[PDB]
């Protein structure tokens, strides 16, 4: 006979709470599974959209769940999900309607798969530096193109940045592919001559005056 | 080197000119003028900052677009030629207009403003031609890659504005404006150059009281209340104008985050707090700062003594200014090229990152010490996470930048030395905090970004040995009152240790020119040994013709002649007033019996007065004449400020 | 291809598919016991197994924890620790953190008596304020005892603060239990006497 | 009211004893004494802060413990008589010692110190007994619940410390302490008092540069570089000592969070930022604080004028402070009792949360305006989030504290009106922010904590009309440089709009005593304002004339017609009837012989001619610390003498 929501909630209002509890518990699972081989923005995208949907479904018993104690679990869990989704920058892929991966990053991931299978097919790592540079250069050029295009609408979405981080770590170290760059005797010849001009100027200005 | 009469004559025509006004608009016009001085100085700071920001951003993209084009093909020596050629082509223009057109714009104008506020008029210090050459000389020497700063020559620039709009005319264009005929009295003119120098300091550093204390020290006069309050009003409007216009230029108008041209950022980071057991550590940084400031002053003095003779034609000055700017390009390139370490580009910390010989995500760390404005370098050496600087990189950068800054100061470009001193001091000061974060094992009190602040003040106080206004600039730029005590002990120690070797930099460049400069402060020597015994006195009703003979000696310059009538003193008459009478608003239009015209009550001392009693009266009232008398009012000797400078 | 660059070795993979099972269950428990706030007493063992499975791998601590710019396994245990410290669930637990405290188990037993006396002493609410007031006073006095005992160590546990919030909001409003306080006549009679003394002092010293 | 000769004697014995020290440990001793001044002023500030904190804690704990007991029982009338008596017992003790022992320790010492730095010597201003009575009296006046502050009396306390330890002689314990021996002139002691008042301001607010500009406003002299650098050294030592000891009292030692006795906080939270379009709004606030400050000063002028005539016996002005101390408690309890709004905890926003008739988790919020320090109430009227204050309780606390602070200031207790003025201003400034944030809707530029700062500055500038130093104290105390431009507009307007009605609080109380008080500049030649019966003195003067001239004209010029030769003082003539004149420096005491005062007289006194204008004779007399100025003819004939009582008339 007690009043509603004060010792115990409404019957229809805990349906919303349990239904939000089902899907915000699935996202934490899919966010820790798709975490170290970083496939985060391309796997957790249908599960982030329904957690932010069920959060707006309890805003149109809002006072019964969201604002009723000093530590608001549903509100801060949704804030955690948003600040993780805005730090990963998963809106830089999933182009404009959050419904499919963008048609500039599916091209990157296809080319990334092609570059890694060209690495592992051609296998000291002498034959990897030759014969396989053409894929690595176009992958790096595509990445820098998307990176300079994203600024005019500071990080790309974490999938493509981690794929490029992996292939930079694999090309730079563990294979040690590097250009020779035999340009040091013209540099030292130009820099010794310009450093010799103050000696000439101050000495001839001292003598012939 | 002509003097400046700061005390009014208060003669008869002065009194009838004052009575008609006071029977009040001549006080509200001072506030209008000081508000305009503040607005205009802030706008000149805005112009300098925006133009240097856009022009240097066009040069480092040509160079980065050339280095990152030849770094995989080969042929990096073309990029060295390009960078030396761009620096030479900017400093050629930037020094060909100082050396040939107006050579008094050379350096920062701080010794010229100190000599002006001390009452010595160097022949072009406040003139519109000096303003255009200095403002465009700063831009062309800061863009042109010299190791210089743009904050020194804001103090001079604003002063040139302050003495321009007060006497409201244009002596260059011969255009007149009857608006401020009253303010052409040379008493008012030294009052406005105080306000303008103060507003220049406050728009330079974001420090309004440091500007007011700058005007109070230099120009050490009697305490004038309304003058000081007008000076403070000018400084506040200066820093607000700069902050407002730069915020509407950057976007986000309601973000007033740029008070000065250098913005140190706030030190409330709770790991920047000091304790009492690291106060005698700060006393040791003052000694290192004083010894290094003495080495800087010694090497620069021998450069300037090599450059007074042997390099004094303007053509050799232009060629020397070019060859410094080509060497600072190649020294920077040889340090960038031979540098091994490189960082993975954390945030907005490089602004032109060079992946020269590094691995596609890493960008060179020596290349960010160059390619980068020294304001951003000094601000990033403060409040930065530890482990951010390789000590070999800062060691080499601090080693070569100490000498490139010492070799650039005496040149005939417009240039400052505050920002290279802060960069040297923040650079080796950060190394000292790194070496304490190694011994103590990364303790919390051994934060390296805090010691960059004390090294910066130690080096700036050691090179230019000003305190009490440099201290208050540092408290308002760090925005932390608790830091004012270690910064004061550092600056005190650096001045005391530096003074036992060599004088300060500004005092040195003042005294190398043969100026009659007075100091702030010998009771055993009375005023009898200070007077000048040949005294040509005029009479009250003196016949014309011997006035022409007294003014037409051409063997002894004199600008003050006491009027007598025994020969008892009656007053003092000047040269300029007497030339006007030989052909009180007919005395101000010519401004760039004689009973009614003479100063009736001149300041006198008897012949048994001590020299600190004479020097206290002469400096604090701004006199250019002081008549020494006998027991009666018979004149025996007279003081015209060469006699106080020579002792 | 070497390990840890494309993929993970399966042992350090299985130390990630195990921590994923413990965070999903903990988020489920947190939201299911969110609003009727049974937080610190339902899933304390789930927080214990998450803080144990984090340190199971912190001591491949580089193959999982420091390998990205966004460290998921790191910043999610910081969420769990920040939520567990803002709740102050250490107060509801023992020194061993293995069971409920001896004080909290006595509060939550006494709270059940007060909520079963409210709903039983009910047919207005002019009968609830009588015959039930002795429970509210001892419950509130026990709460103010616990609060100062916690102050002796330096908010209480959120599990008992929400219970006291519910019963204070159930007593003060919705029942409107109050006290009469016939005390407004002697205060007016005294504060009209003291304010009259300055107009006696200023008037006596003006005349005499 | 005598003067001090800040101009030095410079006679033959000064020139001889200037040798054998230059033949330099005098300059080192000055920096030593300035360091001692800074340390001692910071320690006295710490002692006041700690004792006031603990005693007011004990009083509020006793008073709160008796309200909470009598609430359900029902005897709340007997709890009003406890707080009407606990206030009237601390104020009774702290006002017997001011009325009966030292009435110069009444109020804030700022008019007396402000008259000292001009040169007027109010007779008992810098003794040790004044320091003891003023420190213990400001403690008993703050604990006993008057509507006063405690930062005002820090300036007088620091300058009394500075005049005390500079002499090296107690003159109260009958001691000598043969250490210093050189700083017993009036040219040294006035400079030390200037450094001490600066260190007082620096510990009072946490603002050393504002303390330097305070001590430069008063004592308007020539620029002395080394003097101001010592003054700045003493102010820095003062702020550091206060912060360092108050850190190791709170048991942290690392944060150093308290630079002064009031700490405004950090104004950089991105809600604090102002914009150019509300620069007119601030000007409007400067008008309102100029009107209200004139009302404060007018109502306080017509009450001090009542109290000088009718309430001036020492027994009868102890009884007045007891009644005011009881009435502040009564009005506070009445406003606490009859109020309605209640409030839960906000994490130490009340510090003694009084539940009176609230809902058992809530607390009474009128009792939080009272039962706090005025410091914490000002710090919370700044920096709080919007929606924190009810406009009825805040506007009814504002209306009452105005009259309680206006009726308390002229009392015979040690007190101050900085923190009352800052709390009156921060309250209607916070109300101004509420009506702006109600008219514009929930805006962002309409932040009420931004307008509480401008209201505090406007009220403090309207009551205490003081601009150049107070602006620097405000701009440094909030640690924001961009705030000085609105604040100095607000302090400009509030001066102008104030000065059309009434004078200013510290200036009106200087005028209400017959004090000379030279101002900044002149409001006439030297012939009009001189004094022709001068009665000059011969160099080879036959004594017996000297004992008849001396037995009102403390200075005598020395002549011979009669040509000027110099000045002699009253004190040096008594000593003759350089270390002997300085030995007898505290408290100067037939007939035929001849006295040859040719080596004791000032050989070169400052002289103005007879035709010299009044802004010229006033410029030298005010900047140089002069007390006599000779007016000579054209044959150097002395006619007339200009002293301070000649210049302070017009
Ligand atoms: C007791 O319950 C009230 C409401 O029932 C809580 O008040 C909420 O507090 C949060 C933040 O403290 C606010 O954002 C909400 O808007 C408040 N709710 C309402 C309806 O105003 C209060 O915090 C609870 N107290 C405790 C100790 O848990
Ligand atoms: C590329 O991978 C490296 C690791 O191989 C990342 O470096 C980590 O950066 C974070 C924060 O910047 C540190 O806390 C870690 O300790 C670093 N890892 C190591 C092994 O040191 C780097 O951030 C990655 N970059 C991107 C864009 O993902
Ligand atoms: Cl500079
Ligand atoms: Cl310079
Ligand atoms: Cl006060
Ligand atoms: Cl006060």
Q: Which residue of C has its CA nearest to A66?
A: C35
Q: Which residues of D85-104 are buried (b: 16+ CB within 10 A; e: fewer)?
A: ebbbbbbbebbbbbbeebeb
Q: Which residues contact D522 (CB under 8 A, 6 or more apart)?
A: D614, D615, D618, D650
Q: Please, what CATH class does the domain formed by B30-250 belong to?
A: mainly alpha
Residue pairs spanning B and D at CB distance below 8 A: 165
- Is the CB of D323 less than 8 angstroms away from the CB of C197? yes
Bridge partners for D121 per DSSP: D2
Burial tier of D28 (Cβ tally within 10 Å: 0-12, 13-18, 19+) = exposed
What are the two backbone dihedrals, phi and then psi, of residue D387, each rounded to the nearest 5 degrees? Answer: 95, 10
Distance between start and end Cα atoms, chain D: 18
CA distance D240 to D258: 9
Q: What is the DSSP letter of C66?
A: S
Q: Which residues contact C106 (CB under 8 A, 6 or more apart)?
A: C142
**Contact, D239 vs B488, CB < 8 A?**
no
Q: Which helix (H) or strand (E) holds D336?
A: helix D319-337
CA distance A32 to D413: 70
> B579: which 2 tokens?
């030339």
Q: Which CATH architecture has domain B527-645?
A: Roll (3.10)
> C136: which 2 tokens?
């509210």
Residue nearest to atom 27 of ligand 2 (CA): A161
Distance B416 CA to ligand 4 centre (A): 4
Nearest alpha-carbon partner for D496 in B38, B31, B231: B31
What SS3 string covers B569-622? EEEEEECHHHHHHCCCCCCCCCCCCCCCCCECCCCEEECCCEHHHHHHHHHHCC
Q: Which residues contact A42 (CB under 8 A, 6 or more apart)?
A: A93, A101, A109, A159
Q: How many residues does chain C have?
A: 208
CA distance B70 to B83: 14
Helix, strand, coil fractions of chain B, as percent rounded to 5? 55, 5, 40
DSSP output for D534-579: ---EESEEETTSHHHH-----EEEEE---BEEEEEEHHHHHHH--H
Distance B333 CA to ligand 3 centre (A): 24
List chains touching D (3+ CB pairs under 8 A).
Answer: B, C
CA distance D624 to D605: 12
Which residues from D are below 8 Å from C195, CB to CB?
327, 330-331
Determine the angle formed by the axes of helices B505-512 and B279-308, rounding to 10 degrees: 20
- C-alpha radius of gyration, chain B, whole number: 27
What SS3 string covers B386-439? CCCCCHHHHHHHHHHHHHHHHCCCCCCCCCECHHHHHHHHHHHHHHHHHHHHHH
Question: C93 to chain D nearest CA, in Å?
Answer: 24
> C110: which 2 tokens?
């006494």
What are the two backbone dihedrals, phi and then psi, of residue B556, each rounded to the nearest 5 degrees? Answer: -155, 110
> In the structure, which protein residues have their CB atom closer than 6 angstroms to any atom of ligand 2?
A 161-162, 165; C 62, 66-69
- C-alpha radius of gyration, chain D, whole number: 28
CA distance D367 to B419: 54
Q: Which residues contact B493 (CB under 8 A, 6 or more apart)?
A: B283, B286, B287, B289, B290, B458
Where are the extended beta strands (E) located within D456-549? 537-538, 540-542
Q: Which CATH architecture has domain D30-249?
A: Orthogonal Bundle (1.10)
Q: Which of A138, A181, A184 to mutate to test the interface with B (most CBs of B within 10 A)?
A: A181
Burial tier of A120 (Cβ tally within 10 Å: 0-12, 13-18, 19+) = exposed
Which amino acids of D are annotated as binding site for chloride, given as ranges?
A: 108, 418, 506
Q: Which residues contact B92 (CB under 8 A, 6 or more apart)?
A: B318, B321, B322
Any B CB within 8 A of D254 CB: yes
Q: Cβ of D579: how many Cβ atoms within 10 Å?
A: 12
- Tracing tokens 């200036």 back to the chain, one arrives at D507
DSSP output for C130-189: SSSHHHHHHHHHHHHHHHHHHHTT----HHHHHHHHHHHHHHSTTT--------HHHHHH
**Contact, B162 vs B129, CB < 8 A?**
no
Which residues from D are below 8 Å from C165, CB to CB?
361
Strands D607-609 and D628-632: parallel
Nearest to A36 among C8, C36, C165 (CB): C8
Nearest to D327 among C173, C194, C205 (CB): C194
Strands D540-542 and D628-632: unpaired
Distance A68 CA to ligand 1 centre (A): 5
Q: Which of A162, A186, A191 to mutate to test the interface with B (most CBs of B within 10 A)?
A: A191
Q: Which residues contact B544 (CB under 8 A, 6 or more apart)?
A: B582
Which amino acids of B are annotated as binding site for ATP, given as ranges?
A: 558-560, 640-643
**Contact, B546 vs B570, CB < 8 A?**
no
Nearest alpha-carbon partner for D420 in D203, D84, D148: D148
B634: helix, coil or strand?
strand
Distance D111 CA to ligand 6 centre (A): 9
Distance B346 CA to ligand 2 centre (A): 10
- Is the CB of D74 less than 8 angstroms away from the CB of C183? yes
**Contact, D507 vs D464, CB < 8 A?**
no
Any B CB within 8 A of D634 CB: yes
- Tracing tokens 């519910």 back to the chain, one arrives at C166
Any D CB within 8 A of C201 CB: yes
Residue A161 alpha carbon, nearest atom of ligand 2: 27
CA distance D294 to B246: 40
Q: Which residues contact A58 (CB under 8 A, 6 or more apart)?
A: A16, A17, A20, A65, A66, A74
Any D CB within 8 A of C198 CB: yes
Q: Cβ of B284: how many Cβ atoms within 10 Å?
A: 14
CA distance D401 to D147: 7
- Residue ranges matching CATH 3.10.580.10 in chain B: 527-645
CA distance D454 to D451: 5
CA distance A68 to A61: 11
Bridge partners for B342 per DSSP: B364
CA distance D6 to D119: 8
B114: helix, coil or strand?
helix
Distance D416 CA to ligand 5 centre (A): 4
- Tracing tokens 């004038």 back to the chain, one arrives at B224
Which residues from B are below 8 Å from D254, CB to CB?
273, 275
> B36: which 2 tokens?
């305009």
> D304: which 2 tokens?
């001090």
Nearest to D259 among B223, B236, B482 (CB): B482
CA B579 to each of CA B551, B576, B592: distance values in angstroms, whole numbers, following the listed order: 9, 5, 14
Q: Which residues of B23-56 are buried (b: 16+ CB within 10 A; e: fewer)?
A: eeeeeeebeebbbbbbbbbbbbbbebbebbeeeb
Nearest to A195 among B77, B306, B327 (CB): B327
> C131: which 2 tokens?
């015959």
Nearest alpha-carbon partner for D423 in D262, D634, D533, D585: D262
CA distance D264 to D255: 16
Question: C67 to chain D nearest CA, in Å?
Answer: 34
CA distance D219 to C39: 68
**Contact, D123 vs D4, CB < 8 A?**
no
> B261: which 2 tokens?
């041209």
Burial tier of B313 (Cβ tally within 10 Å: 0-12, 13-18, 19+) = exposed
Residue pairs spanning C and D at CB distance below 8 A: 56
Side-chain half-sphere exposure of D223, counting CA atoms within 13 A: 23
Distance D150 CA to ligand 5 centre (A): 5
Q: Which residues contact D441 (CB under 8 A, 6 or more apart)?
A: none
**Contact, B520 vs B616, CB < 8 A?**
no
Side-chain half-sphere exposure of B504, counting CA atoms within 13 A: 17
Which residues from B are below 8 Å from D213, CB to CB?
209
**Contact, D570 vs D593, CB < 8 A?**
no
Given 1.10.8.870, 1.10.3080.10, 1.10.150.120, 1.20.1440.230, which CATH number is that of D276-511? 1.10.3080.10
Which residues from A are below 8 Å from C18, CB to CB?
none
Any D CB within 8 A of B480 CB: yes
Which residues from C are below 8 Å from A31, CB to CB?
72, 76
Q: Cβ of D591: how many Cβ atoms within 10 Å?
A: 10
CA distance B470 to B467: 5
Dihedral Cα C81, C85, C89, C95, nearest 10 deg: 80
Q: What is the DSSP letter of D100?
A: I
**Contact, D534 vs D557, CB < 8 A?**
yes
C199: helix, coil or strand?
helix
Bridge partners for B604 per DSSP: B627
Strands D628-632 and D564-569: unpaired
Superfamily, domain D537-647? CBS-domain (3.10.580.10)
Which residues from D are below 8 Å from C206, CB to CB?
310
Binding-site residues on chain D for chain C (CB distance < 8 A): 71-72, 74-77, 80-81, 84, 310-311, 316, 319-320, 323-324, 326-327, 330-331, 333-334, 337, 357, 359-361
CA distance B145 to B83: 9
Q: What is the DSSP letter of D641?
A: E
Residue A63 alpha carbon, nearest atom of ligand 1: 20
Enumerate the domain spans of chain A: 13-87, 106-172
Sheet holding D564-569, edge to edge: D537-538, D555-559, D564-569
Q: How many residues does chain B have?
A: 647
Hey, which of A4, A5, A67 would you mutate to test ligand 1's pocket, going by the most ligand atoms within 8 Å of its Cβ? A67
> B294: which 2 tokens?
């003495």
CA distance B112 to B196: 14
- Is the CB of B220 less than 8 angstroms away from the CB of D225? yes
Nearest alpha-carbon partner for B619 in B645, B599, B637: B645
CA distance B221 to B191: 11
**Contact, B618 vs B644, CB < 8 A?**
yes
> B57: which 2 tokens?
């951003």
- Tracing tokens 């108008």 back to the chain, one arrives at B253
B526: helix, coil or strand?
strand
Q: Cβ of B623: how many Cβ atoms within 10 Å?
A: 20
**Contact, B253 vs D548, CB < 8 A?**
no
């Amino acid at each position: 006979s007690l009043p509603p929501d004060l010792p115990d909630l409404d019957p229809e209002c805990r349906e919303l709470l349990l239904d939000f509890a089902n899907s915000s518990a699935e996202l934490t699972g899919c966010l820790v599974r798709s975490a170290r081989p970083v496939r985060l923005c391309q796997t957790c995208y249908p599960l982030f959209q329904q957690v932010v949907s069920k959060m707006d479904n309890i805003s149109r018993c809002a006072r019964s769940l969201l604002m009723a104690d000093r530590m608001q679990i549903v509100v801060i869990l949704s804030e955690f999900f948003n600040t993780t989704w805005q730090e990963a920058n998963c809106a830089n892929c999933l182009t404009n309607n959050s419904e499919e991966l963008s048609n500039s990053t599916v091209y990157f991931l296809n080319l990334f798969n092609h570059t890694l299978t060209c690495f592992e097919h051609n296998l000291n790592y002498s034959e990897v530096c030759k014969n396989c540079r053409e894929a690595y250069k176009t992958l790096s050029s595509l990445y820098s193109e998307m990176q300079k295009m994203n600024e005019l609408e500071t990080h790309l979405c974490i999938d493509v940045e981690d794929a490029m981080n992996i292939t930079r770590k694999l090309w730079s170290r563990t294979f040690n592919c590097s250009v020779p760059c035999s340009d040091t005797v013209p540099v030292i010849a130009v820099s010794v001559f310009i450093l010799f001009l103050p000696v000439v100027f101050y000495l001839s200005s001292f003598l012939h005056s | 080197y002509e003097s400046l009469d700061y005390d009014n004559s208060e003669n008869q025509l002065f009194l009838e000119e004052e009575r008609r006004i006071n029977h009040r608009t001549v006080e509200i016009k001072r506030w209008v003028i000081c508000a305009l001085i503040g607005i205009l100085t802030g706008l000149v700071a805005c112009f300098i900052d925006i133009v240097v920001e856009n022009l240097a951003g066009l040069k480092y993209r040509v160079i980065k677009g050339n280095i990152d084009k030849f770094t995989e093909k080969g042929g990096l020596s073309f990029s060295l030629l390009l960078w030396a050629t761009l620096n030479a082509a900017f400093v050629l223009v930037g020094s060909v207009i100082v050396a040939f057109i107006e050579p008094v714009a050379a350096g920062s104008g701080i010794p010229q403003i100190k000599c002006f506020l001390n009452g010595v008029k160097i022949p072009h210090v406040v003139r519109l031609k000096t303003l255009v050459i200095k403002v465009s000389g700063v831009i062309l020497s800061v863009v042109g890659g010299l190791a210089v700063g743009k904050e020194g020559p804001m103090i001079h620039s604003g002063s040139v504005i302050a003495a321009g709009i007060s006497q409201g005319r244009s002596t260059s264009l011969k255009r007149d404006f009857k608006i401020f005929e009253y303010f052409r009295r040379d008493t008012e003119k030294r009052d406005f150059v105080s306000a303008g120098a103060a507003a220049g300091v406050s728009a330079a550093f974001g420090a309004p009281v440091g500007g007011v204390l700058f005007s109070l020290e230099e120009g050490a006069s009697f305490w004038n209340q309304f003058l000081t309050w007008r000076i403070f009003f000018a400084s506040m409007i200066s820093t607000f104008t700069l902050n407002f216009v730069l915020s509407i230029y950057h976007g986000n108008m309601w973000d007033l985050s740029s008070p000065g041209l250098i913005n140190f950022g706030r030190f409330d980071s709770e790991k920047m707090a000091y304790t009492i057991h690291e106060i005698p550590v700060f006393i040791a940084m003052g000694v290192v700062g004083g010894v290094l400031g003495a080495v800087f002053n010694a090497l620069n003095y021998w450069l300037t003594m090599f450059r007074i003779r042997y390099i004094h034609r303007p053509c050799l000055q232009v060629i020397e200014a070019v060859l410094v700017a080509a060497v600072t390009a190649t020294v920077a390139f040889v340090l960038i090229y031979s540098s091994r370490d490189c960082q993975p580009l954390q945030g907005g910390s490089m602004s032109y990152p060079l992946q020269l010989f590094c691995a596609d995500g890493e960008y060179n760390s020596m290349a960010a010490a160059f390619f980068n404005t020294p304001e951003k370098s000094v601000v990033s050496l403060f409040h930065d996470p530890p482990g951010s600087y390789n000590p070999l990189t800062l060691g080499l950068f601090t080693l070569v930048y100490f000498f490139l800054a010492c070799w650039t100061y005496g040149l005939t470009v417009s240039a400052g030395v505050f920002i290279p001193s802060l960069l040297i001091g923040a650079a080796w000061g950060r190394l000292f905090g790194i070496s304490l974060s190694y011994l103590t094992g990364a303790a919390i009190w051994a934060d390296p970004g805090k010691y960059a602040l004390m090294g910066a003040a130690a080096q700036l106080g050691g090179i230019v040995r000003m305190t009490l206004s440099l201290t208050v600039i540092m408290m308002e730029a760090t925005s932390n009152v608790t830091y004012g005590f270690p910064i004061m002990l550092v600056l005190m120690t650096a001045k005391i240790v530096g003074d036992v070797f060599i004088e300060g930099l500004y005092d040195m460049h003042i005294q190398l020119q043969s100026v009659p400069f007075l100091h702030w402060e010998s009771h055993s020597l009375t005023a009898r040994e200070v007077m000048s015994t040949p005294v040509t006195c005029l009479r009250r009703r003196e016949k014309v013709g011997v006035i022409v003979d007294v003014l037409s000696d051409t063997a002894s310059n004199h600008n003050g002649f006491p009027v007598v009538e025994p020969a008892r003193l009656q007053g003092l008459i000047l040269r300029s007033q007497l030339i006007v009478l030989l052909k009180l608003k007919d005395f101000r239009d010519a401004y760039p019996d004689l009973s009614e015209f003479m100063n009736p009550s001149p300041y006198t001392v008897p012949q048994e007065a001590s020299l600190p009693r004479v020097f206290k009266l002469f400096r604090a009232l701004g006199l250019r004449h002081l008549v020494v008398v006998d027991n009666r009012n018979q004149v025996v000797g007279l003081v015209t400020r060469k006699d106080l400078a020579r002792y």
